[PDB]
C-alpha cells in the first residue's frame, strides 16, 4: 500500500519450531477450572479519556496469574453528529468497528482484512444495538471501536487448534462485555448492561460430553458445540445468540442447557462488569 511501510518483497515465514522431542510435548492441556467458572476478567474503565467512554478488558490465558490472553480495548464515541452524506436518521445509529491490532493480525502483511474482523463487528453490532436505546438520540450516531490487542491464542497458531471459530466466540464474548463497559462509561442510554457469555459442549473422554463455561479449545479434545450469548440479566433477554456445532435434534435438551450455561457465563461476566462500573463511580 501507499499508506504503510511495506515489508520485504519476499513473503516472510512465521517462526517454525524445531520440535526436537515428541516426548517433550507430553500431556494435552486439561481444563482445571470448574465447568461453571469463567476466566478471571480484568476490566478497567476510562482508559482513553479522549473518548467519551472507554474500557479495557484482559483475561488470563488458562486462569494462570500473569499469563495474559485476550486483551480488548474499547472506545465508545458519544452521540455525535452523523456524517452529512447521510445527514438524518430517526434512530441513533450504532456503528461498530472491530480491528485486530497489527500485533494480533493473522498476517503481519495481509492482502485482505480478516473476514473475522468484519464478522465480529456484525455480531457485536447486533448485540449492542439491542442493548442501546436508539430512540433517545435521534439524528445522532455513536461509534463503538474495539481494538483486539491480543487474542487468547496466536492467530497463526489458532489454525492448528481445530477451528478459529471457538476463539472468535471467546473474542466476541469479550467484545460484548468490554463494549458494554465502555457504553456505560460513555453514559449511553442502555436498556440493561449486556455481558458476553460463552459455553461449550465438550467430550474429553469416552464418557458423555460436559457443558463447559468459557472454554478454550486447546483444553479440550473435542468441542462438539458452543454458544455465545449477549444476555441482559435485568431483562432476561438475549440480544445476540450465536451457536455452532452438530447437535442431533434429539439433543434439544443439551442445546437448551448449553444456552442456559452460556447465559450463566454471561451472568458471571456481568457480575465483574457491574463490579467494575460500581467501583468506577
Amino acid at each position: 500500500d501507499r499508506r504503510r511501510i511495506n515489508g520485504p518483497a519476499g513473503a516472510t515465514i512465521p517462526p517454525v519450531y524445531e520440535d526436537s522431542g515428541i516426548s517433550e510435548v507430553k500431556a494435552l492441556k486439561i481444563r482445571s477450572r470448574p465447568s461453571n467458572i469463567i476466566r478471571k476478567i480484568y476490566l478497567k474503565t476510562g482508559v482513553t479519556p479522549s473518548a467519551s467512554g472507554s474500557a479495557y478488558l484482559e483475561l488470563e490465558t488458562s486462569a494462570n496469574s500473569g499469563v495474559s490472553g485476550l486483551k480488548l480495548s474499547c472506545t465508545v464515541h458519544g452521540p455525535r453528529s452523523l456524517p452529512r452524506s447521510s445527514p438524518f436518521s430517526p434512530h441513533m445509529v450504532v456503528s461498530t468497528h472491530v480491528k485486530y491490532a497489527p500485533f494480533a493480525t493473522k498476517q503481519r502483511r495481509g492482502y485482505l482484512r480478516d473476514p473475522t474482523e468484519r464478522d465480529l463487528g456484525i455480531h457485536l453490532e447486533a448485540a449492542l444495538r439491542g442493548a442501546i436505546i436508539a430512540d433517545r438520540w435521534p439524528k445522532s450516531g455513536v461509534d463503538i471501536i474495539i481494538s483486539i490487542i491480543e487474542g487468547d491464542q496466536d492467530r497463526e497458531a489458532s489454525k492448528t487448534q481445530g477451528d478459529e471459530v471457538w476463539d472468535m466466540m471467546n473474542t466476541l464474548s469479550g467484545c460484548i462485555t468490554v463494549a458494554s463497559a465502555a457504553l456505560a462509561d460513555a453514559g449511553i442510554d442502555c436498556v440493561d448492561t449486556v455481558a458476553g457469555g460463552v459455553a461449550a459442549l465438550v467430550q474429553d473422554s469416552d464418557g458423555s460430553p460436559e457443558i463447559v463455561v468459557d472454554p478454550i479449545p486447546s483444553e479440550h479434545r473435542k468441542i462438539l458445540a458452543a454458544c455465545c450469548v449477549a444476555y441482559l440479566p435485568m431483562r432476561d433477554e438475549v440480544t445476540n445468540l450465536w451457536f455452532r456445532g452438530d447437535l442431533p435434534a434429539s439433543d434439544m435438551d443439551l442445546y437448551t442447557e448449553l444456552v442456559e450455561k452460556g447465559i450463566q457465563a454471561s451472568r458471571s461476566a456481568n457480575r465483574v462488569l457491574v463490579d467494575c462500573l460500581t467501583e468506577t463511580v
Partner: protein
C-alpha cells in the same frame, strides 16, 4: 472535483469551427501539435510535449520476487496516477474515468504489442524476475494524454537501461551501475497511440489530436495503437456516438502515416541522445 466544462458559447463555436474545417489552434483536422521529445540525463527518463500538453515518463527496473499474475513470470507495469498538477479537478488517491482509461490503453498497448521480451526479464524462475515499472507523470493536460503518454512510455522504455546481471555457480549477481554498465532493454517493435476524436452529431467530423477544449466538445473518440510496420496493437472506440466504419478505416489509414513519423522521430531522437552519451 467534477471536471470544468466549457461555456455553451465555446461548445457551439468549437463545433461550428470544425464544421468549417478550422480549429482554434490553427491546425488542420488531421494535424498534430508540435511534438517535442526530450530525454533526461538519467537513462529511462523521457519528456514529451504536445504543445501545451507535457507528459514526463520515467522507466525503472527493480529485481523482485514473482507472485500472483506472474508467479514465475517477470512483470512490466505502468503507473499513470494523475495529480492536481495535471488539473485541480484531479485528486490524489482518487482514480478517475480519465486516468483508468489512460492506464488501461497504455498497458494494453505495451503488453499486447509484444514490444518487451518478458522471458528476458526473469533472472531466476519463481524466485527473482526483473520488474520494469514506467511511471507516467502528466505535467500539463491539454488533451490527448493517451497519445503523449504513449510516446513518453515507449521513449522511456527504449531509452531505459537494465542493471547488468550474471549467473555464476547458480548465484545470481546483480550489478549496480558502478559495478557494470547498465544494459539497454531489449525492444522488438515500438507501438504508438493515435487518438482520433469525432464531433458531428453523426460523428462525421474526425479530428486527429484534440485540445482539452476539443475533448470536452467531442462526441466520441477512437484510440489506435500501431507499429511502424502497420501492425495494429489495439483499437479502442469505447462507445460514444457511432462512426461509419469507412471513417474509422480512414482514421486508421491516416494513423499509420502519423505513426511512421513518430517512429522516425523517436529513432532519430534516441540516436541524437546516444551521441551525447558517446560522442
Amino acid at each position: 472535483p467534477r471536471e470544468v466544462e466549457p461555456s455553451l458559447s465555446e461548445r457551439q463555436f468549437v463545433l461550428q469551427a470544425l464544421q468549417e474545417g478550422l480549429r482554434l489552434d490553427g491546425r488542420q483536422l488531421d494535424q498534430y501539435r508540435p511534438l517535442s521529445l526530450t530525454f533526461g540525463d538519467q537513462y529511462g527518463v523521457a519528456d514529451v510535449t504536445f504543445g501545451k500538453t507535457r507528459v514526463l515518463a520515467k522507466a525503472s527496473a527493480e529485481v523482485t520476487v514473482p507472485y500472483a499474475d506472474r508467479p514465475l513470470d517477470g512483470i512490466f507495469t505502468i503507473a499513470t496516477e494523475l495529480s492536481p498538477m495535471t488539473s485541480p479537478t484531479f485528486e490524489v488517491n482518487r482514480p478517475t474515468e480519465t486516468e483508468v482509461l489512460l492506464s488501461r490503453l497504455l498497458e494494453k498497448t505495451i503488453r499486447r504489442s509484444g514490444a518487451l521480451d518478458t522471458e528476458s526479464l526473469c533472472l531466476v524462475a519463481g524466485q527473482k524476475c526483473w520488474s520494469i515499472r514506467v511511471d507516467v507523470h502528466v505535467m500539463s493536460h491539454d488533451g490527448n494524454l493517451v497519445d503523449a503518454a504513449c510516446i513518453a512510455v515507449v521513449a522511456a522504455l527504449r531509452h531505459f537501461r537494465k542493471p547488468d546481471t550474471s549467473i555464476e555457480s547458480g548465484v545470481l549477481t546483480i550489478y549496480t551501475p558502478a559495478e557494470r554498465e547498465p544494459v539497454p532493454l531489449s525492444w522488438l517493435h515500438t507501438p504508438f497511440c493515435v487518438t482520433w476524436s469525432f464531433f458531428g452529431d453523426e460523428g462525421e467530423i474526425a479530428v486527429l489530436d484534440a485540445t482539452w477544449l476539443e475533448e470536452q466538445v467531442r462526441v466520441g473518440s477512437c484510440t489506435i495503437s500501431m507499429n511502424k510496420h502497420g501492425e495494429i496493437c489495439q483499437i479502442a472506440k469505447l462507445g460514444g456516438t457511432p462512426v461509419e466504419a469507412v471513417s474509422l478505416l480512414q482514421c486508421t489509414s491516416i494513423a499509420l502515416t502519423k505513426v511512421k513519423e513518430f517512429s522516425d522521430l523517436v529513432d532519430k531522437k534516441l540516436a541524437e541522445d546516444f551521441k551525447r552519451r558517446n560522442p
